[PDB]
Amino acid sequence: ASTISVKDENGTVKVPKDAKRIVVLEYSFADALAALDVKPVGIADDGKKKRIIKPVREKIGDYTSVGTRKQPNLEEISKLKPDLIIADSSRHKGINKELNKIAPTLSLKSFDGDYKQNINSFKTIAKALNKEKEGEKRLAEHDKLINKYKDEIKFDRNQKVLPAVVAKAGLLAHPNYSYVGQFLNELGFKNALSDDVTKGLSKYLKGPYLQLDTEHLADLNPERMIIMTDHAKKDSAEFKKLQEDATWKKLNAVKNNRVDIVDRDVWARSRGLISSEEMAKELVELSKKEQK
Numbered sequence: 001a002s003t004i005s006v007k008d009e010n011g012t013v014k015v016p017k018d019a020k021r022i023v024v025l026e027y028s029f030a031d032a033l034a035a036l037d038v039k040p041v042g043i044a045d046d047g048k049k050k051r052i053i054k055p056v057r058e059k060i061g062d063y064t065s066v067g068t069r070k071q072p073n074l075e076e077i078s079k080l081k082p083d084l085i086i087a088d089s090s091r092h093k094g095i096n097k098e099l100n101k102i103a104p105t106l107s108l109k110s111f112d113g114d115y116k117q118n119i120n121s122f123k124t125i126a127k128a129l130n131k132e133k134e135g136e137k138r139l140a141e142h143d144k145l146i147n148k149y150k151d152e153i154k155f156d157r158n159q160k161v162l163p164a165v166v167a168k169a170g171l172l173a174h175p176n177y178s179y180v181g182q183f184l185n186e187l188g189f190k191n192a193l194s195d196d197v198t199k200g201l202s203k204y205l206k207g208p209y210l211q212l213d214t215e216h217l218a219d220l221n222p223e224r225m226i227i228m229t230d231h232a233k234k235d236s237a238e239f240k241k242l243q244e245d246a247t248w249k250k251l252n253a254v255k256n257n258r259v260d261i262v263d264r265d266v267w268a269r270s271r272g273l274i275s276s277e278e279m280a281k282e283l284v285e286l287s288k289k290e291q292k
């Protein structure tokens, strides 16, 4: 057994050179494999086929679900007898010992990784699978496409942007160092949540995100909002109570038609090359709609 030594979040991992059958425990890792022409044999898809973004889903074809990302089914992982497991360095610390009994396991950033960190995980996966050259070519293609979309997004970058999900009668905002915040910065946007602003709102942190009630949204008053929801729906009970609020109606982004509701699976959960390409493409389309 020859191996390839790579670094992951726990140190060195010796990956067998014959690794072909791979179980992945986050969506970004499934994108990484598909980009490299590898079909994972198992995926923690939360029991929802639609959670794997369409172009990735269709490329991979049939696979076996190993259950939720929160609590993967180790019986199902062990039954697959994989060559390699790719686990999330934040989600899967608890099961790491058990996973290592089953197969060589890489522990890589996804859930707690920003845009660049997710890219890096992709690079580690490419190296682990003796596909470094293929990964370089794919990433050069990706970067060229992202920059092409950047140039095609017509929005005025001086309109500061707030990316957020809906939570508890307000917005749970993704700050400038989040995956979404950093990606928007890559596209030349200015996050409304500057470092100073976020410092001044930190008593409202809930882990990685900032809870903003309508009072604090009104104070921030970002020129643009991107609200990520399941199925890109805007008629949930929570969001409707928010949209009915008097302070909401006075917001600069609301009055001026600069609030866009986008798909949470694509924008927040996927964290892949294909999904970030689709996020950028969507911004181009939105920016080209009848100005009105």
Ligand SMILES: [Cl-]
Binding pocket: 111, 268, 269
């Ligand atoms: Cl997620």
